[PDB]
Amino acid sequence: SKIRIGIVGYGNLGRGVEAAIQQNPDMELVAVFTRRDPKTVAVKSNVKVLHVDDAQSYKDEIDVMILCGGSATDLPEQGPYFAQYFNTIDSFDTHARIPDYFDAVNAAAEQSGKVAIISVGWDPGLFSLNRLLGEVVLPVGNTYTFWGKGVSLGAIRRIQGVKNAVQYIIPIDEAVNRVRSGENPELSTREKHAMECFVVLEEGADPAKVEHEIKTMPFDEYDTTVHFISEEELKQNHSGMPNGGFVIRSGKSDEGHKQIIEFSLNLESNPMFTSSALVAYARAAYRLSQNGDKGAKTVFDIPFGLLSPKSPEDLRKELL
Amino acid sequence: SKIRIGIVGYGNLGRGVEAAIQQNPDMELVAVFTRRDPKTVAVKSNVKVLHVDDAQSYKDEIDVMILCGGSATDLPEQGPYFAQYFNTIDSFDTHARIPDYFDAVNAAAEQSGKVAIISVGWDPGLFSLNRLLGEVVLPVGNTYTFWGKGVSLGHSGAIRRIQGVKNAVQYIIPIDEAVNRVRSGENPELSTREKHAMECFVVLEEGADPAKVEHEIKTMPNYFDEYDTTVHFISEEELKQNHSGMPNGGFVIRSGKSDEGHKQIIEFSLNLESNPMFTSSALVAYARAAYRLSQNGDKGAKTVFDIPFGLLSPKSPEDLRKELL
């Protein structure tokens, strides 16, 4: 029988999860839960939509609940809540709150007997794994993480004179080059990334005051370029959510040999990629739960074989 | 306290494991086991050297034995042998033979209650992980693996048997145009000859015929006849200055699509000045995991697919979440 998935939240990440489930035929989307009145949600696949207050009564209809809410307000409540009733996966990405979030989810999952895998995605998630791998295989060395080029995700739009805007984070090619050369550079924040902002001015706003306001936002840490454009220009050309980056470990053998590991992503859709990772880890959470594991997990606790619908024997024959 | 390591075999990989122990202060090397007469092995770290027939008697002195032998003849006997007495790690790398090796090691480790992790290294090992990660995160897509620039070890020796050759070094090299086609997300169908080229650096004997030597290499069946091959003739001096290293590297790339058609590309690469030093560095990190799994009650043969990355680190689980997550 298919592994039965529920989604909580139908923003960009929830839509991406629904999309990813189409690519994973051992799973089936059984329900979408929303804080909105569910009669007002149009889900592409037309599975049932329910209010989050009804989720508990679906305890036995769902194998893994994928929490697709944002980390700022949704997940801090939702993670420990849903971990009482369901194996859960989420993309929790507030670094400072990671340890408190893990402990809250853990307490809940340990008492329920469910498996919760937190902080899945590409950073945290796939990049975290690469940072780890780098430092255990090359214990003497440095790690560098670069983000973008990519849309970054607001307070720009509270700035007076800005009608709309889209902001990019961009790694500085020279810094990436120095890292890839094995120089093991001491790089400041400003040396690693540049920011680019595209802004649609409100009618009769002052371009120069708007520019200076953005650059000195409490952006002040980076070299930032502002571009003023039309509303048609932002709709047509800045609606996409590309992203990417690099994790590089630059190390040395005990005899001085330079060894370099690099992991990189080039994504046309950030949310669709994050979602696809959430669905792979939902497979692992199901497998762990069926083997009688429980409690909160991160990517550091999941062996990669659990992520695959293939048997362990077939993985050994095909991929190893 | 310290995790007690033993090394079987004191070639390039054994020497590398010794070196990596220097960078892992939670471990200590206890013994080096060899098939040679042990009085005749000079070990850099000055640890005791023993004959392999004696290893069973050090069962209680060693937490993990790292098997540093080759896959062609050493490991097929040594993996199932040592797994009867010791948690083990090896770099078994004959991909078409992994299932049989796994079964034999698993039969042995399951009975002894020991943990054996097989096929650790760059490929198999870290490239395998990344092949797997790609296909689970991007299930609609194609995977490509490229090797090099690096030495193919069958190959340098096959050239050396050619009449006229004093010495030689061969490299496999990914073809840049093919790598960039994969990176663009075209999903190309790549022939053997499109994916990698071969480069040989050859020191000729007095009065060998260059053209005969070139010709013999490029047409060598089962080695170079599948590939575009360049042969360079050089001096003994340049072979030493420039070609005594064991560099390697490569790429694993997954090129896939979201359900709405977005191109998503994942790439993993290695650029190594020393292949044996890198592999052995992996072997030591996986020895930490084998020790952890042993202490928790596990047993049997495992591959990298069975090892969660947190077990590779000497840091606590909480400290990993704090620092890296």
Curated annotation (Swiss-Prot), chain B:
One of its GO terms (biological process) is diaminopimelate biosynthetic process. NADP(+) binds at residues 10-13, 34-36, 68-71, 91-93, 120-124. Keywords: Amino-acid biosynthesis, Diaminopimelate biosynthesis, Lysine biosynthesis, NADP, Oxidoreductase. Optimum temperature is 65 degrees Celsius. Thermostable. No activity is lost after 30 minutes incubation at temperatures below 60 degrees Celsius, while half of the activity is lost after 30 minutes incubation at 65 degrees Celsius. Pfam families: DapB_N (PF01113), DAPDH_C (PF16654). Optimum pH is about 10.5. No activity is lost after 30 minutes incubation at pHs between 5.0 and 11.0. This is Meso-diaminopimelate D-dehydrogenase. It comes from Ureibacillus thermosphaericus. The gene is ddh.
